[PDB]
Symmetry: D2
Subunit: 255 residues, 4 copies
């Protein structure tokens, strides 16, 4: 576990901060001296995150499928802490259906919340970062956005779109002092994926053994948070437009 003094007094917005990776990201950032706006679709969970964290952190409710609500989030961060230095777009949904059974309604929702949402956070965060002299962004994608996982079509399509979001953000805002990188976790112990791992094949492992074989073990959300906080830090001054693979080796070999 490493420290970053460049993060003391910085302001960060974390979306999906109510549970899992986002709650883990919010708490780690607070411990680095950040002012954190914990945003979530579930208003109570957001309040509860800020309550767990302390460190003067604040909460707000955001449905990242609505642009106006994203604008109101950034406004609230500015009004609570004076500006915006860091962004972690982590809000998202998982959806499971074969590619040929997925409905348009489901696809639209998954693209709106995941892809359109991550973009809109960058669209309204970045202007405020430019005023501060630069900033850092991490969008959470998934291994399913670069490698196929059966049943994750819509989801995977949205998560691929996020991987490219970071590149185009890096390209367009590097001369404004802004960095953007994508984090690709594989299998993490969080409520969001617990819905997903209900997927049980004709074999009794297949989640438990699937995950052990591919990744070695289940990942703790805390292990993704240390990566996110590194990527937001000045130790990552030379890292922009990259896909950070944090999959415990999953795609490094034939397992």
């Amino acid at each position: 576990s490493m420290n970053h003094p460049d993060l003391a007094g910085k302001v960060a917005i974390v979306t999906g901060a109510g549970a899992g990776i986002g709650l883990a990201v919010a708490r780690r950032l607070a411990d680095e001296g950040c002012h954190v706006l914990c945003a979530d679709i579930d208003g109570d969970a957001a309040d509860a995150a800020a309550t767990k964290i302390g460190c003067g952190a604040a909460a707000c409710r955001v449905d990242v499928s609505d642009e106006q609500q994203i604008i109101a989030m950034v406004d609230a961060c500015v009004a609570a802490f004076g500006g915006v230095d860091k962004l972690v777009a982590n809000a998202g949904v998982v959806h499971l259906a074969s590619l040929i059974d997925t409905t348009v309604e489901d696809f639209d929702r998954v693209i709106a919340i995941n892809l359109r949402g991550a973009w809109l956070c960058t669209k309204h965060a970045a202007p405020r970062m430019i005023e501060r002299g630069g900033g850092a962004i991490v969008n959470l994608s998934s291994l399913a956005g670069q490698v196929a996982v059966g049943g994750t079509g819509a989801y995977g399509m949205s998560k691929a779109g996020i991987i490219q979001l970071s590149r185009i953000t890096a390209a367009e805002l590097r001369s404004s002092g802004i960095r953007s990188n994508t984090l690709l976790p594989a299998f993490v112990d969080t409520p969001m994926q617990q819905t997903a791992m209900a997927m049980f094949d004709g074999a009794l492992g297949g989640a438990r053994s699937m995950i052990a074989r591919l990744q070695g073990r289940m990942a703790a959300p805390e292990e993704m948070a240390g990566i996110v906080v590194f990527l937001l830090s000045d130790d990552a001054s030379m890292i922009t437009g990259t896909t950070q693979i944090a999959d415990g080796g999953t795609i490094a070999a034939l397992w």
Copy 2:
């Protein structure tokens, strides 16, 4: 590929037209689908050899279903699909509007998916088939201005992988073609917003590619010569991303 039935979306102009003509030269029955019915008819007419024309708005699932059915009615079934329908949009990430984002995704990514969603069951009925989704180098490397476009093209790259994955056991293959700079009306309009176009092309890619050059790759990807190629991202960029030029 003689005797095979192919649907090509955006067949009215550009790569789609070169792809349709080229599949026709290979003995293939071709349904030319386009949002412009006159371009569709004009293409089918230009090609001549059995090709049918069809008007499709790939933002509308119902019309995509009708297009596949039209191809079954005209030709018996469906063996090959080339999803080339698309739109370009230019605007910075921060100046892009929700409406333009939604429309670019709807047409490019959703449309490409829906085309596979409904063509694939017909390929299953035939014992298998092959899909080539047309994306862009801009779906993998950021070109400034091309946010919503690029994001949608990136998602198509992933469409092909998930398709290949779930449908391999049904004998269906899917790959993405990533052209860079090709002489087409869709692009020429785009590129006309000018390290500017002319010299970038010469330097990265060597010269502008013809739509025909792309067509011969599509056809290769659709053929039994590509029988062990599936879920891949095919780069036809003249070296652009291979080197620091």
Copy 3:
């Protein structure tokens, strides 16, 4: 199966043309109207390939670990057919050992034959191609050169080096009219890999079932030859410095 009239009367050198992918490449090229020099470490196998093929094709012996022998190969192709338009570097060895047990002697041999060999073929082929107004090259690598396969360290290191060979060849010779691309087959029915698949784990599939799960089925060498001949053709005019994955989907998903 598709045709290419642009290949009639073209001259191709195929190394490792005695068996497997190379024999398959040589025979397909002959059927496209190519003059083929079938080169192999095993002189008899080379003669026998040219004998199977007919079509005026010729044979020569080459140990691609020796530069002089590579020079003599190109000389013989020039003397037999007048020049050199196409190259397929396919000569190679497989070696199996854990990364920590591999000897220097074994590493050196595997790098010399695979990596140094493919390079040297390009070094002495390319000048002759430049005289003809351009040309095409395919180097055979392996999925093991981009993804880890346990026991293939040296081999995999050499095969990665080949993937980059193509990029640097494309870069340096594009303005001379020369294209270079790498083919990455996974699991093919050839004698070269049959040594490899003797690798049997604590489970009875593990080759048979390993290969079915990952790739769907065993690949026929003929299926790699159609890809090589495409890549050498003018239908690939816009393809240079790429890694052609012909793995039947192996790395497209979590299998």
Copy 4:
């Protein structure tokens, strides 16, 4: 990382020196290995805090074995390894000689492998460890002139994957760092053969990177914060390959 033991090859100058100093700031015992013994001593002396110096020619397996043993003797064992030793060579693909190719491979690729070969058993004896192999953007994207160099750097990228694969169950992680343009003597000499250096750097990467900036990534990759990062190729190129610049 306090209390951990690290071997850094090529610690005498450049990224290696920044890596050694930076691990020292983190409470880590460091063996500074370099082909130049004076640079090794000078580095260990500059750092001061327990660091030992060691002369190594990574083309020679026997000296690599002695280096690991020296680190065990000095500090008890080995937890971390940073293989940064290397040489640059410039020559076109067709003008490169077998001798220069052999030497570049020997030092860069073989040397990096041998360092892992012998350090890893010591990491196993400790319950695990972490490796960072230093490669180059030139190992993935072709820079003209850099053939043998690039080929060797590409192989290192694969070293890290096979290492991660076979050694994950022993608690060992391995990753590659791919810097682009960093202000170091090794590079400055290289880059001095001048779309030329100054402007390419500004355009692709934004500015030249400091060796320190690279060091902080190495340290991150060696830390328990990177506990779910293994077999990866870490890109620290300031955006170079993310966009068409």
